[PDB]
Amino acid sequence: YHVDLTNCDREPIHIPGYIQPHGCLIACDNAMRMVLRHSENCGELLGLEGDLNGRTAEDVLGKRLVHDLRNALTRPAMLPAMETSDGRSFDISLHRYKSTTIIEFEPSLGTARKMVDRIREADSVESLISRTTRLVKATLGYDRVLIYRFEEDGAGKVVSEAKQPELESFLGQYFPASDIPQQARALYLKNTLRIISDASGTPIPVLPAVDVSGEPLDLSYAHLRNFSPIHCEYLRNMGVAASMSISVIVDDALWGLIVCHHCSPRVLSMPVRIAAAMFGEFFSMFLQVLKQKRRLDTINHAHAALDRFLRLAAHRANLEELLVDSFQDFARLIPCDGVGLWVGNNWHGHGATPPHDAIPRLARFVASVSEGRVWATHALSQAIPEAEIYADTAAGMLAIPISQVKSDYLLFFRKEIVQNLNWAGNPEKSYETGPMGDRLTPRKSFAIWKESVRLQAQPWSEADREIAETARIALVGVAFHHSELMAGL
Ligand SMILES: *C/C=C1/C(=C/C2=NC(=C\c3[nH]c(/C=C4/NC(=O)C(C=C)=C4C)c(C)c3CCC(=O)O)/C(CCC(=O)O)=C2C)NC(=O)[C@H]1C
């Protein structure tokens, strides 16, 4: 077995058989009686000799320490400043997973509260995320701090950045979903924090990698777990020697990551990591609440806007004329780059929309698939091949029925997503490569993403769809109310 670009999507990164060099690791049985595995550097760090496997935990660590560890017993217990029998001092991380006890040893001020105080008053998602990269960079001292937000398809967008002036910007850039494989996302979801202390360091083998019964050691919750050589190469091509990531959990899902990159080796001590993880939890909670508030404000605004229109309709004899005069104002309901009105087989457009002569084909399509419901796509050329030609202007379409009887619609459009990019990076910046080649570089990642979203628009969110359904009911309703008046006209 060797990992490469053909099979890295399935790399079993939870069982790498190695740890990072800034600590050592002992695996014991579920009762913590016997040593089953140990990293090769345990002898050096703990002051021991030969094969530790088979020796008892007490033999290896001391009765005192084993007692304290048992008492501490999948969320790892953090025990700063513990001592082994001979007086060597360690920050110890202890957990049980799959009924194996894993003990991690690192040879070894109100920070979290003060950091959290500086974000608690953020009053929008942007205000929260902008200040956080700045704050985390200043407090933790990394050369770059980013926040990635995952799109619905899994792609990452770099939504905030604080960096050393001489580093290139990645702000507004996207990376393909495949840049972080599924197993990596599963581990990000399980552990608040992920540390890479030295990307160019030499990893330390776990002894044995595979036990007598054929089982590998599952290091899913071990902070010393080594990382993929694919990512190692990616980091090295970027000039990045160390990282720490904080998982952003919103509504029980992985919303994104706060990622700290350092151009030289770096690892935070256990007490600072505890503070950073606590910060991450509060950041996640506050973000969750701010997203929810923004959604509420958006729905509230839309209802008020629909009421304003209904108020006008109550003083107009001719609803169709009112719609022809007003339809552009519905662009305020749902973010869009254009909007149009298809009523009585005539088209009226505003903003970025398909060309006038393309509309009858589009309207026939909408009438065939709507079935009196909101219908939406962010890949219009997949439904109408001829739409490819105008994808630069209108690649996404959301259609709202506005009559219970006639095939009349209000149509919202969005441009293909590359047209709305706001990328702060340097197009002249290039990257060196290793054996796997230029795939493992930001430049190439971004190019792959751009190619993957050709002819597609930003997807219509659940909130967009909810507003559209409310608008359908309002407009179908008022059309029915005016139907005798319009029959007369
Ligand atoms: C086929 C597998 C691939 C792969 C695997 C891994 N990626 C991991 C982390 C990771 N990779 C990236 C990708 C980036 N794309 C960019 O464009 C960019 C910067 C502009 C970056 C940094 C990211 C964002 C991350 C998240 C951590 C970080 O940002 O430093 C990963 C886990 C590493 C670990 O064990 O902690 C695996 C495994 N990466 C690939 O690119 C493909 C080929």
Author numbering: 6 to 78, 85 to 119, 126 to 506
Sentences from the paper on this structure:
Phytochromes are biliproteins of plants, bacteria and fungi that use red light as a source of information to regulate fundamental physiological processes, such as photosynthesis, seed germination, flowering and shade avoidance. The molecular architecture of phytochromes shares a common photosensory core module (PCM), which is composed of PAS (Per/Arnt/Sim), GAF (cGMP phosphodiesterase/adenyl cyclase/FhlA) and PHY (phytochrome-specific) domain4–6. Bacterial phytochromes can be grouped into prototypical and bathy phytochromes, in which the red-absorbing Pr and far-red-absorbing Pfr are the thermodynamically stable states, respectively. The conjugate Meta-F and Pfr crystal structures has been obtained from the engineered photoactivatable near-IR fluorescent protein (Agp2-PAiRFP2), derived from the bathy phytochrome Agp2 from Agrobacterium fabrum.
Preliminary crystallization and spectroscopic experiments identified the PCM fragment of the photoactivatable phytochrome Agp2-PAiRFP2 as a promising candidate. The half-lives of the photoinduced states of Agp2-FL, Agp2-PCM and the PCM fragment of Agp2-PAiRFP2 are 170 s11, 20 s11 and 233 min, respectively. This Agp2-PCM variant includes 24 substitutions, which except for Val244Phe and Ala276Val do not participate in the interaction between the chromophore and chromophore-binding site. Agp2-PAiRFP2 was crystallized in the dark adapted Pfr state (in the hexagonal space group P6322) and the structure was solved at a resolution of 2.03 Å. Remarkably, crystal packing and crystallization conditions differ significantly from those of Agp2-PCM. While Agp2-PCM shows a parallel orientation of the two crystallographic monomers, Agp2-PAiRFP2 monomers crystallize in a near anti-parallel arrangement. However, the overall topologies of the monomers in both structures agree very well, as demonstrated also by superposition of the equivalent Cα atoms of both constructs yielding a root-mean-square deviation of only 0.6 Å. Also, structural details of the chromophore pocket are very similar, including the ZZEssa stereochemistry of BV and the exocyclic double bond of ring A of the chromophore, which results in sp3 hybridization of the C2 atom and therefore an out-of-plane oriented bond to the methyl group at this position. The chromophore interaction interface to the surrounding amino acids, especially potential hydrogen bonds, hydrophobic interactions and water molecules, are almost identical for the Pfr states of both Agp2-PCM variants. Ultraviolet–visible absorption spectra of Agp2-PAiRFP2 compared to the wild-type Agp2-PCM construct, the full-length Agp2 (Agp2-FL) and the prototypical full-length phytochrome Agp1 (Agp1-FL) display the characteristic spectrum of Pfr but an enhanced stability of the final photoproduct state, resulting in slower dark reversion to Pfr compared to Agp2-PCM.
